[PDB]
Every structure is written in C-alpha cells, then in structure tokens.
Design a protein around this ligand. Structure first.
Ligand SMILES: O=C(O)c1cc(NCc2ccccc2OCCOCCOCCOc2ccccc2CNc2cc(C(=O)O)cc(-c3ccnc4ccccc34)c2)cc(-c2ccnc3c2CC=CC3)c1
Lengths: 94, 102
C-alpha cells in the first residue's frame, strides 16, 4: 500500500472505418475505476473487406488485445485487465 | 493523491503479428523509472499491406493501432508519494487501411 499522486486518440482516429477489418467501439464505464471510461473494439465483420467492398470470409477479422493497468476502489487496488483496442485482418494459414 | 494497494504486483523483464495483412514487429520500450518498466510496442513491417500473392501492395497502408494506458512513474524519495500516475500511448499492433474509398 503506497501513496500515489494522480488526449485519447480514439477521440479523433479514423482507422476503425477505413480498415479492411473495421470495428466499432463499446463504452465500458465504471465510476469505481480509474480510468472511469474505456472503449473496447468489436470487429465489425467475420471476414475482411476485399477490393470490391465485400466481406471475404476466407480472411479473418480478429481483435488485437492489450493488457492495461487500472485502479479499483477499495483508497484503490491496482489491477490489470485485457482490452480489445482494434481489429486486424489475418490469413488463416501461411 | 490516493492510497494504492499494489497487492501481488511484481516487476518482470497468438501469431496475428505474422499472419496479418499488416504485419508488425515488437520493440522494447524500457524505462527503469516506470512500472511496468518494459512495454513491447508494435511497429508495422511495411508501408503497404500483404496481398494474396504474399507481396506488399503500397496503394494500401499498414498503420499502427494505439491504446492510451496508465503507468506508474517513480517519484523522488524526498516526496510523500512513492508513485505518480501517468497516461501514455502504446501501439499494440497494426491494421490495413484503404487511403481512399471509391
Ligand atoms: O489468401 C488470401 O486471399 C490472402 C489475401 C491477402 N491480402 C488480400 C486481401 C485482404 C483482405 C480481403 C481480401 C484479400 O484478398 C482478396 C483476393 O485478392 C484480390 C486482389 O485484390 C488486390 C489487392 O487487394 C488487397 C491488397 C492488400 C490488402 C488488402 C487488399 C484487399 N482489400 C481491399 C483492397 C482495396 C483496393 O483498393 O485494392 C480497397 C479496400 C477497401 C478497404 C476498406 N473499405 C473499403 C470500402 C469499399 C471498397 C474498398 C474498401 C480493401 C493476404 C494474404 C496473406 C496474408 C499474410 N501473409 C501471407 C499472405 C499470402 C501469402 C503469403 C503470406 C492472403
């Protein structure tokens, strides 16, 4: 137990819309948490968008996750959580 | 100023990054004055994206995906706080974007 003294690009980025594996954000709010609001990505399609603007289901939209530090009120407890931050397009086999 | 229970935290030293059409490499961001002191950040391998033939198509863009994250910053011992909470940006991977539509 220690004493701790206490700009988001998602407010302006457009990759979620122009990606071949686009996504949308879901608001995760917790007033018992710092940060109080985090935004999690959910891939928009199963497959990926091809050059004709159609979903190619052989390719796979998958979410990229990042482990982040959060504070949970207890005075706080330091914890780690897994957040989906965007999606990428993968081939199922090389 | 708050009181943080660090509980069981201690310092430490999928293959999408390769199968993606916008593949990336991870680079070591190290700062002994920070917790976590090491963060692995992505840097896209190419300006373009990989096409069905396995070559790079530069009319498409590989771009990094960023996440704002909390980190602990070391405070001098003279200070009543052990740590200083900060926000930094980390690239977690890359995506392939079209530069223009239609
Ligand atoms: O097995 C597969 O097929 C395989 C496929 C891909 N990349 C191609 C690909 C990606 C995604 C879907 C299909 C793909 O291929 C389909 C068959 O090819 C049709 C040919 O198209 C020409 C090129 O197109 C691309 C080239 C690069 C990236 C994305 C695309 C296609 N998307 C696209 C193109 C364009 C453009 O303007 O061209 C515009 C948009 C667009 C984006 C967003 N909103 C829109 C809205 C409206 C209109 C367009 C859009 C999307 C890589 C690997 C692979 C991945 C990783 N390691 C390896 C390999 C393959 C081999 C070895 C290793 C394997």
């Amino acid at each position: 137990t220690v004493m701790v003294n206490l700009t988001n690009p998602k407010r302006s980025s457009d990759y979620y819309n122009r990606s071949t594996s686009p996504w949308n954000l879901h608001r995760n709010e917790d007033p018992e948490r710092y940060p109080s609001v985090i935004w999690e990505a959910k891939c928009r399609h199963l497959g990926c968008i091809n050059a004709d603007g159609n979903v190619d289901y052989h390719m796979n939209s998958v979410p990229i996750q990042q482990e982040i530090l959060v504070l949970r009120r207890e005075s706080f407890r330091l914890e780690k959580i897994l957040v989906s931050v965007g999606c990428t397009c993968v081939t199922p086999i090389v």
